[PDB]
Amino acid sequence: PPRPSSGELWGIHLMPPRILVECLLPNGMIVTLECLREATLITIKHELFKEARKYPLHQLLQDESSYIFVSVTQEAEREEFFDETRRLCDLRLFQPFLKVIEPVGNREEKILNREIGFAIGMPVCEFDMVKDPEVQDFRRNILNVCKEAVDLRDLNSPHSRAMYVYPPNVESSPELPKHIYNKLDKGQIIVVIWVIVSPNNDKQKYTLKINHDCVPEQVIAEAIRKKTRSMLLSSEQLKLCVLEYQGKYILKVCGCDEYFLEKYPLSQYKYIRSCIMLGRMPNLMLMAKESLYSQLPMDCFTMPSYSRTSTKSLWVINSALRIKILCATYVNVNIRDIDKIYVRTGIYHGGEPLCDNVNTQRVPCSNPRWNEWLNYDIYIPDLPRAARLCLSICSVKKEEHCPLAWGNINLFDYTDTLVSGKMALNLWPVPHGLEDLLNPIGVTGSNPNKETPCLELEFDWFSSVVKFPDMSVIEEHANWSVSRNELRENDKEQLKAISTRDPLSEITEQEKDFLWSHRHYCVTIPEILPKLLLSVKWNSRDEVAQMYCLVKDWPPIKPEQAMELLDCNYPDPMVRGFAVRCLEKYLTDDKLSQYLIQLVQVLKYEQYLDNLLVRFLLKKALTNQRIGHFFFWHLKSEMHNKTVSQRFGLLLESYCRACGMYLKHLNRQVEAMEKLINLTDILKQEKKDETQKVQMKFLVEQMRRPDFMDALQGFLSPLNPAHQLGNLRLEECRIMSSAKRPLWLNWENPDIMSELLFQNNEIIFKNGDDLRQDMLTLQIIRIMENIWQNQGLDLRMLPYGCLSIGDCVGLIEVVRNSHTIMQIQCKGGLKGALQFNSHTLHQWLKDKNKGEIYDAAIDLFTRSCAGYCVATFILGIGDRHNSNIMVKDDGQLFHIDFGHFLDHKKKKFGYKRERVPFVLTQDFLIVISKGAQECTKTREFERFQEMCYKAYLAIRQHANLFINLFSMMLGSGMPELQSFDDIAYIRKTLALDKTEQEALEYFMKQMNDARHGGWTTKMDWIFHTIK
Amino acid sequence: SLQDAEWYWGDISREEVNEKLRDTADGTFLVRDASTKMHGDYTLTLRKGGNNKLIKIFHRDGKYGFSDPLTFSSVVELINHYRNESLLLYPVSKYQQDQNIEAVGKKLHEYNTQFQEKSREYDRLYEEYTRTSQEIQMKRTAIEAFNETIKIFEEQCQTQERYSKEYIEKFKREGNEKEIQRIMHNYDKLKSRISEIIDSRRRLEEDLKKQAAEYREIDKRMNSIKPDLIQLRKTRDQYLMWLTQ
Ligand SMILES: C[C@H](Nc1ccc2c(c1)OCCn1cc(N3C(=O)OC[C@H]3C(F)F)nc1-2)C(N)=O
Ligand SMILES: Cc1c([C@@H](NC(=O)Nc2cnc(N)nc2)C(F)(F)F)oc2c(F)cc(F)cc12
């Protein structure tokens, strides 16, 4: 199984400098050899064979090369160490010992299976021992997607391979909003093309003024025209020279591995649009196509070793559903206090029950035996395809009921077969805080931990193997059900109002029947499909069959709208397939990367391992390495979770089998992260009581060791694979003064023109805190900026990078030239004041932007401040303070640390719910009003309020998208987002049960109250105490 | 007479309606305001077959109802009419909360103090429960690793017994006792090492056996105090509801 600790030996974080390794020779002898913890297996084998000649049977020892080492790893696996360049510490041994053996089997196949297993977290042989035919059918059948994805990469190669490795980092639309177009000099952009001339890197620049919408090949054409401008070529000769060589070069971003390889307008590339808004000069580097294509290796996709009766329709069986509960093996309960136990059962279609729940008779705790046939209030033909049995063993103790162990089963298996015969089910433990007697939202399947309460079951048999009907049968039955509407002016107006309602709105039973009765008129307004589907009686064969036909011929919808149909509320395979079809045809690679967090989460709701969503996401992962990179990390980050280890493990294995050479790069990142996890685990556990100076001494000593220097240098940044992390600047590395003591790392940018982007790349590694909440908040902030910017509202956010890479382990991107509001306050004078001067922030910003650039900095502060005020209000980010708000030297205000704003939402013991009030400090209004004393009434404040009103309504217009993005996250193990009630607060702030004008007035009321609430209270800044 | 009715619950959220409808799974019901903008229009939540269904009470021309025939003069008349049609079953009463102002307040502090002391014990039991569960899974894999380690050393014994077999025959014939005792010194070193490994594995098997029993007893203590913790939460919440009235 996956390793429980990143230690170099079992229960030992670090090996001592020298260690005694028991070497088991091939002649039969046993030699204890002293080795350095950083010694390579090449050195250890050479030293072992020198000492082996001293011991007996030395005549039977062949050459060192003829043998290979073997040992038990901490994953309880017999690993054959093919790569002999590996260090003893990096081998992950269970105990210090190595057997020398004659190598066997296909060496090249075994090397790849080690590399796949290392990146996954678990060994590949674990999947071979799984006897579930669905698990082996997934492994075999999913390779059809992998082979199709690899065939696309070698369709128009080497350009197809180059596009896979370096996808064009572009925005979804080439239309530049008016505020972005107005920043161009008469629609034109001034760019700088660089070329390397001499081997010692003698550079040459070419400043060009070109139209913003020039495709990269037209940029190359203008560079060719400038270089061949004084070569006596006629207007015809030059035109034919330009047209011949424009396709022989490609542009690259100076400082990083981002290439302009596709025919998109230059401005559609995110780097160029960023340069336009920031007013920066784009620095691109020109190079020959063969210079990049020679660097790309053609890694072939070898097929693995694992790649090699009557049936009655469900609707024929006219009978009531019956399930017999035989007995449970045991139950962790005390015979005193608890009187009896029973098995509560229910048939569900997602969270909604299809019928009244049915319990077994109560039996004594010591003898869990029922042998009772339970009859459910639904007939077998009326079972929808996603019908599931949800059960649990409960206790009794007015009368109180409590769940003890829960479990769910798919009533139809992956081959459409209805469950039949006897079957055992190892039950799962009750989650913390779940008081519900059943867990329908919980994982569907038997607990892999077989040392758990096992409940035997029995499903009825019907002479033949019962299978769910074909689409041909369902289509014919739907036409029969219609043979066994009206409309009015109010009906069309009511349908349009219901489609615009947010997903969380309350749909009444009259509205449900109204939508179902006018279901054929609904096709004219396709955005109402989610509301109509909730109105379908899913426990009715006739309504479901008719819905299937409407879904079959339903027109497509926006991907943002189709995403809702993948959350917990829509479990039907026909609805989910419809949603995937919309994403296949309409979701761009920009939006797929944008919403990949949720799309990976909704994979957990799928009933079966092989399905249309996973086949879609794995295809985009294997045909776009930017999508593939985060697809790997979002799945790898949850491999510790035994609930999803097998699902995500099988998926990651299929990804790694065909991702190509990128598996080598991901292993480098995994190695580097394993070392940082182990290093920080020592500081977090044994060396926790030691001083900051003492911990830093240890940190330097360990980071300098060769094993650490090799592992932590020359690898791609997991936060952005376009950034390479070269040599580590050890003098710049430090333990930060923050929660969980995160580690600040610094690397040189090994790019040839690093100087034109960033010389050093800094990342904060944090071990202890759950970063999913920060990741999701930062994603929402990026999506809000994206809405505002697309609408033409220039509000600048800073959604810095954040990536969770394990169980409460992650990376945070460092923003260069930024400081907290308290760091600004302390940097600028102070003199022990207790009350910080409110004008200090304005003065600091004035000094950083003197002269002409002053007005620009104030505008950027106003635009960034306005949107963070709106974002923090809509999301209820009330935990804001002078140490978790930062301002860049250029004036950009942005917020950091979003893991703690929901800690005090709970309300228990009459705390009024702690409503998040809208607030804006006087310090910021002084910056916005350019140092005015009466800052609450200036023309700059007037514009600022107007910025917030427009931005607030722009988010309220797309309220359904934010509700859908959070609704998809409910299935994730995040304790902050479990039920739709945790999202309900966004409806209070966005005022969704009001008109747009009423919501604008509501927001204006909360913003005008914030002026009164921004009280300059006479209290010290350290402890906050009033006289 | 809607304020006098027990089933009318002012302006409660959707979360509190579904919370107050879980064990009551038959035909339990309650009424509340549909929205602040409507005000005069209310909503009726009924249980049905598991899912809590919501039915709106429309209000136009003074008369109330669900469909076109508004044959009801008041909201109270509308609900009382459908109770007689059933003979809807149980109303969620805000007034009915069976146990002076001084006694209700002092005993509420006693139930809150007792609930927080038992909540603290559940946090201690859960922290040790998860710690024990994590340690059990580690010991379970450490046994799998020891089993594979023992299998490797057993294969090494069969390798030594096979290769040394022909050399021992040569040295016995040649009378070279030094080389027989040198090969036996290494064999009895390999065999004693296996004993040390099997002792370590069996030592950990008993730690796992005892930690599994500890885990089962932590889970028994949690499952015995979980019902006590829920009835104390419902008791203290009723004492606070009556204290406000
Ligand atoms: C020199 C240093 N620069 C800096 C520091 C922290 C962050 C940052 C830049 O970039 C913004 C992203 N960021 C995010 C966080 N943190 C966060 O998300 O939670 C707590 C805190 C911790 F990780 F350090 N810290 C930073 C400074 N001003 O002291
Ligand atoms: C859950 C959740 C939310 C909701 N916000 C609040 O509940 N704010 C609030 C209200 N009252 C108090 N006392 N404290 C906080 C909401 F934004 F969705 F509405 O936002 C989240 C977010 F951005 C990221 C995330 F990972 C989870 C969530």
PDB file of C-alpha atoms and ligand atoms in Angstrom, chain A residues 772-774 776-777 780 874-878 898 901-906 913-916 966 974 976-977 982-987 989, ligand 2:
ATOM      1  CA  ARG A 772      -7.980  22.781  -0.448  1.00  0.00           C
ATOM      2  CA  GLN A 773      -9.910  25.762   0.989  1.00  0.00           C
ATOM      3  CA  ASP A 774      -7.151  28.155  -0.163  1.00  0.00           C
ATOM      4  CA  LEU A 776     -10.815  26.791  -4.025  1.00  0.00           C
ATOM      5  CA  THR A 777     -10.914  30.433  -2.768  1.00  0.00           C
ATOM      6  CA  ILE A 780     -13.053  31.629  -7.249  1.00  0.00           C
ATOM      7  CA  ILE A 874     -19.736  37.866  -1.481  1.00  0.00           C
ATOM      8  CA  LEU A 875     -17.711  34.961   0.037  1.00  0.00           C
ATOM      9  CA  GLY A 876     -17.861  36.147   3.670  1.00  0.00           C
ATOM     10  CA  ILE A 877     -14.082  36.397   4.111  1.00  0.00           C
ATOM     11  CA  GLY A 878     -14.348  38.218   7.461  1.00  0.00           C
ATOM     12  CA  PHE A 898      -7.926  31.802   3.153  1.00  0.00           C
ATOM     13  CA  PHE A 901     -12.492  32.428   7.362  1.00  0.00           C
ATOM     14  CA  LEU A 902     -15.094  29.652   8.010  1.00  0.00           C
ATOM     15  CA  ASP A 903     -13.827  28.518  11.460  1.00  0.00           C
ATOM     16  CA  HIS A 904     -16.318  30.624  13.484  1.00  0.00           C
ATOM     17  CA  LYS A 905     -19.382  30.173  11.173  1.00  0.00           C
ATOM     18  CA  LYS A 906     -20.723  27.230  13.338  1.00  0.00           C
ATOM     19  CA  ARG A 913     -23.994  33.295  13.743  1.00  0.00           C
ATOM     20  CA  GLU A 914     -21.128  35.912  13.616  1.00  0.00           C
ATOM     21  CA  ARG A 915     -22.463  37.591  10.405  1.00  0.00           C
ATOM     22  CA  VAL A 916     -19.556  38.707   8.169  1.00  0.00           C
ATOM     23  CA  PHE A 966     -19.237  24.923  -4.881  1.00  0.00           C
ATOM     24  CA  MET A 974     -13.466  19.189   2.626  1.00  0.00           C
ATOM     25  CA  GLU A 976     -16.110  23.172   5.146  1.00  0.00           C
ATOM     26  CA  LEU A 977     -18.312  22.093   2.135  1.00  0.00           C
ATOM     27  CA  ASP A 982     -22.735  25.629   3.586  1.00  0.00           C
ATOM     28  CA  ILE A 983     -23.253  27.412   0.173  1.00  0.00           C
ATOM     29  CA  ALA A 984     -26.590  29.082   1.281  1.00  0.00           C
ATOM     30  CA  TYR A 985     -24.665  32.104   2.704  1.00  0.00           C
ATOM     31  CA  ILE A 986     -23.718  33.183  -0.919  1.00  0.00           C
ATOM     32  CA  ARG A 987     -27.481  33.742  -1.578  1.00  0.00           C
ATOM     33  CA  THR A 989     -24.752  38.295   0.096  1.00  0.00           C
TER      34      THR A 989
HETATM   35  C1  LIG C   2     -18.414  27.213   2.470  1.00  0.00           C
HETATM   36  C2  LIG C   2     -17.734  28.269   1.698  1.00  0.00           C
HETATM   37  C3  LIG C   2     -18.152  29.535   1.389  1.00  0.00           C
HETATM   38  C4  LIG C   2     -19.349  30.356   1.720  1.00  0.00           C
HETATM   39  N1  LIG C   2     -18.943  31.505   2.494  1.00  0.00           N
HETATM   40  C5  LIG C   2     -19.289  31.621   3.847  1.00  0.00           C
HETATM   41  O1  LIG C   2     -19.950  30.750   4.402  1.00  0.00           O
HETATM   42  N2  LIG C   2     -18.813  32.788   4.482  1.00  0.00           N
HETATM   43  C6  LIG C   2     -19.041  33.006   5.874  1.00  0.00           C
HETATM   44  C7  LIG C   2     -20.293  33.305   6.443  1.00  0.00           C
HETATM   45  N3  LIG C   2     -20.456  33.477   7.773  1.00  0.00           N
HETATM   46  C8  LIG C   2     -19.295  33.331   8.557  1.00  0.00           C
HETATM   47  N4  LIG C   2     -19.389  33.510   9.917  1.00  0.00           N
HETATM   48  N5  LIG C   2     -18.028  33.051   8.080  1.00  0.00           N
HETATM   49  C9  LIG C   2     -17.948  32.882   6.759  1.00  0.00           C
HETATM   50  C10 LIG C   2     -19.917  30.913   0.354  1.00  0.00           C
HETATM   51  F1  LIG C   2     -19.116  31.838  -0.217  1.00  0.00           F
HETATM   52  F2  LIG C   2     -20.114  29.957  -0.566  1.00  0.00           F
HETATM   53  F3  LIG C   2     -21.103  31.506   0.504  1.00  0.00           F
HETATM   54  O2  LIG C   2     -17.198  30.234   0.671  1.00  0.00           O
HETATM   55  C11 LIG C   2     -16.167  29.355   0.474  1.00  0.00           C
HETATM   56  C12 LIG C   2     -14.997  29.590  -0.243  1.00  0.00           C
HETATM   57  F4  LIG C   2     -14.771  30.751  -0.801  1.00  0.00           F
HETATM   58  C13 LIG C   2     -14.063  28.591  -0.316  1.00  0.00           C
HETATM   59  C14 LIG C   2     -14.332  27.377   0.312  1.00  0.00           C
HETATM   60  F5  LIG C   2     -13.404  26.439   0.228  1.00  0.00           F
HETATM   61  C15 LIG C   2     -15.500  27.102   1.008  1.00  0.00           C
HETATM   62  C16 LIG C   2     -16.428  28.123   1.084  1.00  0.00           C
END
